[PDB]
Structures are given as C-alpha cells and as structure tokens.
Design a protein around this nucleic acid. Structure first.
Lengths: 91, 83, 107, 97, 103, 96, 79, 97
DNA sequence: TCGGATGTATATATCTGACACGTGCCTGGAGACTAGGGAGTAATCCCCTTGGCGGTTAAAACGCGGGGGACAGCGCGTACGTGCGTTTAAGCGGTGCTAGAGCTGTCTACGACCAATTGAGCGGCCTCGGCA
DNA sequence: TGCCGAGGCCGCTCAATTGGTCGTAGACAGCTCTAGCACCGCTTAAACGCACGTACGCGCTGTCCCCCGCGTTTTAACCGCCAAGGGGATTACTCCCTAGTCTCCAGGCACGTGTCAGATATATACATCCGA
C-alpha cells in the first residue's frame, strides 16, 4: 500500500539529525498521521457540506484545522499551511 | 461602540443553587460558586469558539442555531429541537 | 514537462500526491480542491515535525538514541495540546507517564 | 417561623425535577454569551434561537456535572459538595488532565 | 403501486433513497438497502413513540412533548446507550434522589 | 419543504396509540432525531462497505451496521423487521 | 467457565501498581474481573461483527482496531 | 532478620511498572479468555496472533486508566485502599453504567 | 538514629542485527488539454435583530439566627502488605496439517442515467371538539 | 368555561414509479501457500498458601463554624411596543475551476551492499531505607 513510512526518517533528520526511529515507531507514527488526516478530512468534508458546497478547498482545510486544534498549535499550523500555499503559488 | 465588562456575575448565586437542586444535591459549600462560574466559562469558551469558527467559515457575520448545534454535535453533546 | 514535483514546489517533505490520492479515496467529498492537498501536507508535516522533536527530546534525555513508542507516549502525555488532540489514544506497548500521588508518599 | 434546615431544600429538588423552564435569567446569560464571544470575532450577531440553544446546552451540562459531583461528595460520606468534588468529577470525565 | 406501499410500510422509501444518494455515504446505493433502512427506522419510531405515549398518558396528558421523549429515552437502557449524549430541548431531567439525602 | 418525515410521524400513531397527538414542538425533535439516527447508521454502513473494499452499500451492509450500532435486544428485533420487510417486498411484484 | 480466573490476583495487582496505587481490597479482584469481562464482551462483539460482515472465519487485527476505534478508544501500532 | 517497612515495596514496584512498558498479563490465559468469550458470539473462529496482542494492549490500557481514576477516587475519600465502591463510582462518572 | 544491607544506575568488552548506501525500474506522479458545471459575484428584498424606552414585578442581595454538618482526634480491631516455601503451568522451542486468507480471472446481474407517466401528499379551505 | 389544533374536502405538481441501456462491481471458482492450530516435552518464572505484624478504615465523639430559611429591601429581567437597517436568504449568470485522458519520466521500491550503534552480562560505586 501507500503510506508515509519512507518519510518519517527524512523529516526526523532535519530536527534531530543524531537519532533514528525503530521498526514499530514508524508504524505507530504512520497510523497516527493516517487517522489525524482522516479526521481533518472528514471535518472539512462535513464542513463544506454545511455551506452547501460540494468541493473541499484549502480554505476548508484551514477552517477545519483551526476548529479542530486550540490556539497555539492551531495558529502555527495555519502559518505553515499558508507558507506552503504561497510557496506553491510562487512557482 | 458596545464595550462590555464583567458579565460572569450574571450567573447569580441563587441561579447556581437552583441548578444544583435540579441536579439533586442538598447542601452547597460557599466556595462552589466562583469555581462553577469558571467551569461554565470554559465550557462556553469551547462551545462558542467552535460555533464562531463555523460561522466564519460560512462568511456570515451572524451566528445561527445550526452553527451552535453543529458545534455541540462535534463536542460530543448533540442537541435537538433546532433543525 | 521539466519534471518538477508539487511537493518539491512546496518545499515540504511529505508526498502531496499521496495525500491527494488519500483524500480522493476517502470520498470525504465529491471533489477535492487544488491547494487542499498542499495545505493538508503542510499541516501534517508540521504536526509530524513537532511530535518527533518532542519524542526526540524525551528519548535523548533518557540516554537513548532510538525512538520507540514509549518515547512517543512520553512526548504526547508531556504536552497539553497533543493531549487534547490525542488523549483518547492508547499507543502500542503503552508506557503510561510516571507519576505518584503525593499523599501516598511516606513521612 | 423557621423550618429546620433541610426540609425546604428537598422541596426545590423534587419540584425542579418535573418542570423544565430555564433556571438562568435570559438577559444575563445572553449578555455573558455576547461578552465571551466578542473576543473571538468583534461585533457578531446572534439569532435568539441560537442563544436559547446555548442556554439549553449549558443548563444540561451544568446539571450533569452537578449530579456527578453530588455522587462524588456522597462517596466521601459528605452531603455538601465542595470545589474538590467538582475538580475530581471533571478530572474523571477527562477535561482537566 | 409504490415501493413504500409495496413494502407495507409508512415511511417513503423515496425519501431515504434520496437521502442516501445525497448523504455521499457511498458512490452507489443498493436496491433493497433503502427498503431495509426505512423498515428499521419505522420500527425505531414505533418503539420510541410507544414509550413516549406511555410516559405521557400515565401523566394524564394527551399531547406528547419533548419532556415525554426525554422520559422515554432515559427509561430504556438500549435507547440510552444509543442516545446517551442527547440533550433534548425543553427536557433533560429524570426524577430521582439518592438514598443518603433523605432524613 | 425540507423533504423530511414530519408528514408521517402522526400517521404512525394509529398503529401504536389511539387518541394521543403530536405537539408542533415535539414533532420537530422527533424528526431531527430520526435524521440523526439515519445519518449515524448510514455512515457506519458506508464505513463497513469501505472496510470490505466494496463500494456499493447494499442491504446486507445496513443489516450488519444496525447490529453494530444497536446491541442485541433491540438490534435483532430491528433486524427481523428489516428481513420481513424485504420478504414482503420480494413477494410483492408485478405478478402480485 | 473458570477461564476468567486466568487473570490472576498478582497480575491485576501489578496492573494497579502501574496504575499507581498502594493498597488493594480483596473484592477489587472480582470487580475488575467483571468489568474486564464486560469490556471484552463489547469489543469482541464488535470485532466478530466486522469479521462476519467480511465473510471470514479468522479475526484480523485490522477489524479489531476498527472495533476499538468505533467503540471510542482507538489504538495505534497495528495500522 | 531484616524486613522492609510495609508500603515501601509497593512504592518500588510502582516506580518499576511505571518506568517499564511491557505487558503485565500472561499471554496464554488472556488468549484462552478471549477464545472462551468469543466462541459464544460465533463458533469455530480463528485469531491472528497480532489481533489477540491488540486485545491485550487495549485491555491493559483500559484497566490502567480505570485504576488510576479509581485511585484518585479512593484518595478523594481520605482512604488509600481502593475499594469496589471506588470502581463503581469511577465507571459511573465515566458514563458506562 | 548513622551505618550497614540491599536495590540500583554506572563502565566496560561483545556481535549482530537493524540500518545507511549504490543499482535498475516502473508505476505512480506530473504536464498539458478539453469539456462541462460549482460556485463566485452581484443585485435585491425583506426578516429579524439590534437599540431603546417605560412599567412592573419576580427575583436577587443583604442580614441574622441557629441548627447540622464538616472536621479533628483516637482507639481499636481487622484486613492487607511482606516474606518464604511450595506448586504449576507459561513460556520456551520445535514440528507437522491444513483451513482459510489472499490473489486472478471472468462472466452477470445490477445499479446509475435517463425519457415518460400520475397520483399522493402538499396548498389552501370548511368545519368540529378537546387542551388550557 | 373558552378558542385553537386537527378531522374531513377538495384541487394540484413534482417526486416516485416504469421501461429501458449499458457499463461495470462483484459473485463466484479456482488455485496457492501462510499463518494459525494442536501438540510434543523441558525450565523455571511466577502464582499460591501461609504466617505475621501493623497501618489504617471505621466508628464514635466532641467542637466550632457556616449554609439555610426567613424577612426586608433593592434591582434589573422581562414584557410590549416601536424603529430600522444589516445582512440572510434568494435568483442569474458567467468563468474559472476540476475530472478525466493521454503521454512521459523520475522517487520510491526492491535488490544486494557494508557497517557501526544497541542490547547483553559482569563488576563498581552509589541511593535508599531501616535498625538505634
């Protein structure tokens, strides 16, 4: 199947370069990423349904993640997402 | 414009007492009041935060019953009688 | 052509195409937007970086250089926001936070 | 006259367990909602139905927490709820870690 | 003849069919699935309405009000486990006192 | 308007009671609750069909989701209701 | 049958120790056995329902995680 | 003739079993229990070893959570010995009875 | 009790085993195009909601006594931690079968889309007996 | 004892129903080989009993204090009514977005490839706890 397991070492190396994941830490991390992605996705979905729209846009994900997370980490996630959005917009 | 200050006192002592009677408790310590006010405050904090986010997503300057009922449904405490 | 990747354009490390396929597969709606998978990849990578940094601290301080689920639950329980998000999760191989009620301590 | 403490207390428990009209005055609770709201987004607006729903939900949450803390205080062989009882009943339900 | 009538039921199977096809619960819906769903919904309505009508008529009243629905729900363990986190408007109380409270 | 069940909540009382009648307030509550139960059972059936890798949400999916939501006592009763409803639909065709 | 006694006294004693308790009452053993049997019954019912729907005879870990997640308490480390 | 003071060994095993992470219930008894409790729901079933391991982990986590909760409970009543009433109160507040 | 006994984190040599690394590849990811509709934008209109003002009155505040209950102390008898000896069955590692998970195919009914029809419950009336 | 919710009436229009098409989801058959199951015996880690001391759960008792209930006084909630204009909800229309298709190519994958940090076991000194 398709998952995020070959990526956790990459992202880890940029924060704690002198470390390494186990063979199951990657598995639990992958399951966690999967289910929180599913949570955010279904939130954005049943959010866009309320406004009678049928699609899911970046604004929907933004509203969903701000509605799903409290202040600090929420706003930091918003900042990261907006930075990525404008970065893609550049190219 | 519409500046506001200190509405937490709106939940008065006898109101809390009547709520507790409805809950089914005989005696009430004096220190219960302010802390249950704070509890109500944080509960309303979370609920209306979810509600106002719902509103902002819809590009609506007003809050509707559907907004708060969705917020409460997400909070794990659903509600009826409004849509 | 020119063979440029959307994830590469976003300067991220998560596969935006993969999360796009996940979105379209989970049928969360009838159609997904252009920037929606980009934003999702961004927020997911930020969450991953944060939790992995916390676990790396909670492991390296423990004189070990190999992250195991024990350290993951350390990092989760040692944060209020992560708790509020993942407090309803039981990580495999457990490892409940070490705490003792002060009244139980002796004189 | 002066009734023995306890007799009148039981009356307002069995009585309010039948009727269902709101126990919190409308205007103060509505003003409190306006207050706690304006911090998130300024000069909002509320449908009367919406604030009524807020009041209903908060009343339900409060009565639930109060019967739970009453169970707590009973378990301690007391009949007077105390802040420690509220804190314990909230911690067990899981909203204060 | 209509499927709802063909089923010998009271709910319009067309309504639940449109709901499912609009609820995006799947890409396509089954043939008899809406019929079965209408059946289970009609049975649940019948049960809850039996309970509410009893909890209202015993109160010497002929108008079912949400208070009676609350009585019906809070007096059935199955419905409770199904609808525990429900807070009905104009309801939300069950008459009971603990033992140690009475003198 | 709304396309809901409210035109049918009264007409089932005649099968469960005789003189009682619904209040204009309680009917909306019952309707919202029925919509909520409908959604909660449909999402479970859809999740189940997705787990089994199927994409069609057929009768058996609902038949299993209803016992997944409702425990034994009411679950099996509702199941039997659905089964006999399916039987009555099958035996009622163009040939009648 | 008596298979519930497989969860022995020192087992749940150590369990409660990890829970962070100092003293145990004798009846705690039976009470915990009962509540554990209830929790099993529920989760096993949901898992076997999942499997029965999948038209299988074994019980995959995946359906167990599905049952736990649907029950309210999720579980990681098993996908 | 040395002997530890009553209670200290409990503290030490608390520290140990909280620092460690491995399971605490013997595998085969728990597996036999899952078997005997499943066969009545549907006869002649099979279990992937990973599935029974997942059952084990989930049950350990649930029990340890309920135990720390009931410990808070029993503490709230000035006692240090958890009693069944504490378990009933914890389960009722958590809302499953 | 301070010192002695005991459980514990600390230092050091092992191998081995999960992990960093270069090699084809291929399949999914990216590019570009098109055709079609979801919704973004814009008038608009009228619903309601926010502001305010007067009474009026149920309800909240304040105070005061006084009794019930929270709480400290104690004692006492019981139930449980501690430790040592004893039984047992868990867990260890092989070992062999096989039912069933899982993968492939393929043929078929089955379910979405659509053109055409209609009567069923929906809009608005007329009128009667019970809920308040 | 009063008037509004609902039984009974009648006309409509659009959602349910029929008939039909056709692409495809999957039901079914078949084959493979994986992991679960039952069992075999061996070691010993751990559960089990028992005795014993003792920490504390509980019950009682006394005290002291602090909620309740009541009466009086204040107050602002509420209810009616009147403005009013802000924006919630609506329809119309365009366009700009996505789905889908085809082509093309490199990131991840599976492979083999070394390779050094990580768990093991023994000895060291320390933290801790409990006895004068």
């Amino acid at each position: 199947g398709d998952s995020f397991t070959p990526y956790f070492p990459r992202v880890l190396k940029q924060v704690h370069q002198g470390l390494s994941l186990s063979q199951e830490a990657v598995s639990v991390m992958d399951s966690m990423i999967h289910d929180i992605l599913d949570r955010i996705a279904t939130e954005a979905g049943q959010l866009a349904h309320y406004t009678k729209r049928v699609t899911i846009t970046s604004r929907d994900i933004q509203m969903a993640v701000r509605l799903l997370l409290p202040g600090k980490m929420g706003k930091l996630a918003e900042a990261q997402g907006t930075n990525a959005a404008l970065r893609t917009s550049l190219c | 414009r519409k500046v506001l200050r200190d509405n937490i006192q709106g939940i008065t002592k006898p109101a809390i007492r009547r709520l507790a009677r409805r809950g089914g408790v005989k005696r009430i310590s004096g220190l219960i009041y302010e802390e249950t006010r704070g509890v109500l405050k944080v509960f309303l904090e979370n609920v209306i935060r979810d509600a106002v986010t719902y509103t902002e997503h819809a590009k609506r300057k007003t809050v509707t019953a559907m907004d708060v009922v969705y917020a409460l449904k997400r909070q794990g405490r659903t509600l009826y009688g409004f849509g | 052509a020119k063979a440029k990747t959307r994830s590469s354009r976003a300067g991220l490390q998560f596969p935006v195409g993969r999360v796009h396929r996940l979105l379209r597969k989970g049928n969360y709606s009838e159609r997904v937007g252009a920037g929606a998978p980009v934003y999702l990849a961004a927020v997911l990578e930020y969450l991953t970086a944060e939790i992995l940094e916390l676990a790396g601290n909670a492991a390296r301080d423990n004189k070990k250089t190999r992250i195991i689920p024990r350290h993951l639950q350390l990092a989760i329980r040692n944060d209020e926001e992560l708790n509020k998000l993942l407090g309803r999760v039981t990580i495999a191989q457990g490892g409940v936070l070490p705490n003792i009620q002060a009244v139980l301590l002796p004189k | 006259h002066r009734y023995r403490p306890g007799t009148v207390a039981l009356r307002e428990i069995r009585r309010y367990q039948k009727s269902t009209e709101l126990l919190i005055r409308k205007l103060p609770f509505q003003r409190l909602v306006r207050e706690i709201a304006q911090d998130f987004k300024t000069d909002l607006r509320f449908q009367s139905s919406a604030v009524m729903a807020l009041q209903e939900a908060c009343e339900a949450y409060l009565v639930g927490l109060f019967e739970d803390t009453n169970l707590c205080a009973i378990h301690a062989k007391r009949v007077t709820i105390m802040p420690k009882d509220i804190q314990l009943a909230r911690r067990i339900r899981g909203e204060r870690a």
